[PDB]
Amino acid sequence: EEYKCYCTDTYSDCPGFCKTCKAEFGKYICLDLISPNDCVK
């Protein structure tokens, strides 16, 4: 989409795509930067 999208989806644990994350409010939060295309729909 632009320079380098930022992965910020939430999960139940650091995802293989977001080795860096944080568990808050019970879910997770991604703080990585990647953009191999427009997006993952």
Binding site: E1, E2, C5, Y6, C7, D9, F17, I34, C39
Partner: peptide
């Protein structure tokens, strides 16, 4: 396949 919540408000 990365994440479904990709942040990119600025194509």
């Amino acid at each position: 396949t990365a994440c479904s919540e990709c942040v990119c408000p600025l194509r």
